């Protein structure tokens, strides 16, 4: 029992992080068989890329591995990302995949600052596309992930803070997650909305820990339920979002249009003073995946 | 900028997990040169475990180090832990110690099924000895853990669960945190304080994060706070907690007593629908050696 907002273990991730320094910039790589992938803008001196990188020399790139150098021999642009061609495969490359994800879900990230990890949290990419992250000067070219037995999908790397202090960034592709570039200009989030299956399923992860005190004689229908929904910036429910809280739903034995009814009146009451899973506020950063993973027993390696 | 629930990055402890198995028990061990540290309560059939301990032979316990069988050559008990001596030394063995931490003080979970780690959290030691963990049936010999440059901190392993959902544990030397034994006994987690401290280096953590709407004009003496601190059950402060908030003090350039101002209103009043660091009640999970690491850039590797 307990219920805790994990990562997954970074190992695997760790050793792939290498120092990127071309000009004055100092960055973070991700080195996977022969490659460094990193953010665009650590190329020198309003920006046309393209024009910027052909001026540049593979001699400019100064890559780190440790205490080692990596000589590199070809580079290339990504969208956003740049790819740096070494003449040393990794021999730490973990079996990978680059995967886009959708807002709603979640993943790991493990800050670096001058290609060394620091720390290691859990993630939701929000309904705007920014991710509520925990960065500092230097850590650019941090990543996100998952792990899936042993298999490591990477989905995020980072770029910028934006000026609300969230955090924007591309998938591995070096296509940016959201309406954000990668150049100076006064652009801003958007509006947020609360992640409603997600809240759903932390829920039904709060009644599998004997928190049950917000459950209730009540049901709802999925439309009434939603006009409450979006009065209270919340996403709408799909019948996809209820069928995949279909397991968590058996495990207890509450239907999910019953825990929608317990979210109605949360929504509707506050919680007056109580808690759940040792929080004030309904929390949206749990699929319904880490419910179950959590709560069942799967491993990875 | 942000700020979140952030736990070491985990490969160096990752590298010693292991898969213990001795009777139809199985848990998780710790491989560090050529001891395997594991729970003595995987000795087979209330309980004398130095009785049953000297009825055991090396060829009974089976170590998994992931597809590799490691031959035991000899085995004792310390404390509470059994120390299980294999022929082969780690070579992943990072350099480490065994410390024992205190109440207040926080570190990283890596949590483990069948010698193979699931997830990794952060933890504080609670004032009475337990852990808000997270974790299932077979997670017994999963460590908690501290990095400092290059070297890991051991101090936590995982031994059971208690009936209000805690856990509870010992260091590395096998000596319980808090009153528990391992054996089946009525045992309970004795009434929690909350970290008074670790509330103020959090809110010092949103200072520095934006977040000051808690912030006042009144001040305090150490005396008339810790009056209102017992009234809420929150740890005294002493004049050492004091003195080791002085660097966030100078950073935001709010004076300690201050800052106590505010936590007392803030316990008084309640926060009135207002959030800070996207919680709704006051964290007490954030050392001032957490807040100091994750908002000026130290790493570790």
New interface residues.
């Given amino acids: 029992?307990?219920?805790?907002?994990?990562?997954?273990?970074?190992?695997?991730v760790?050793?792939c992080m290498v120092q990127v320094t071309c000009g004055t910039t100092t960055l973070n790589g991700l080195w996977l068989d022969d490659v460094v992938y990193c953010p665009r803008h650590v190329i020198c001196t309003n920006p046309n890329y393209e024009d910027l990188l052909i001026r540049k020399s593979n001699h400019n790139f100064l890559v780190q591995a440790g205490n080692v150098q990596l000589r590199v021999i070809g580079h290339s642009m990504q969208n956003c990302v740049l790819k740096l061609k070494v003449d040393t495969a990794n021999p730490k490359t973990p079996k990978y995949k680059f995967v886009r994800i959708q807002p709603g879900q979640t993943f790991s990230v493990?800050?670096?600052?001058?290609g060394?990890?620091?720390?290691?949290?859990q993630?939701a990419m929000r309904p705007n596309f920014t991710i509520?992250?925990?960065?500092?000067?230097?850590s650019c070219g941090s990543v996100g992930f998952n792990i899936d037995y042993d298999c490591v999908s990477f989905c995020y790397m980072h770029h910028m803070?934006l000026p609300t202090?969230?955090?924007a960034g591309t998938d591995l592709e070096g296509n940016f997650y959201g309406p954000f570039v990668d150049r100076q200009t006064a652009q801003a989030a958007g509006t947020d909305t609360t992640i409603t299956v997600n809240v759903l399923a932390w829920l039904y992860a709060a009644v599998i820990?004997?928190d049950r005190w917000f459950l209730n004689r009540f049901t709802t229908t999925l439309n009434d339920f939603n006009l409450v929904a979006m009065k209270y910036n919340y996403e709408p429910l799909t019948q996809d979002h209820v069928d995949i809280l279909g397991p968590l739903s058996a495990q207890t034995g509450i239907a999910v249009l019953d825990m929608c009814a317990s979210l109605k009146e949360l929504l509707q009451n506050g919680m007056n003073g109580r808690?759940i899973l040792?929080?004030?506020?309904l929390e949206d950063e749990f699929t319904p995946f880490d419910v179950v993973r959590?709560?069942?027993?799967?491993?990875?390696?």
């Fill in positions: 029992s307990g219920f805790r907002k994990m990562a997954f273990p970074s190992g695997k760790e050793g493990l800050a670096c600052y001058n060394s990890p620091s720390g290691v949290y993630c509520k992250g925990s960065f500092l000067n230097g803070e202090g969230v955090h820990n004997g808690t040792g929080s004030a506020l959590q709560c069942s027993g799967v491993t990875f390696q």
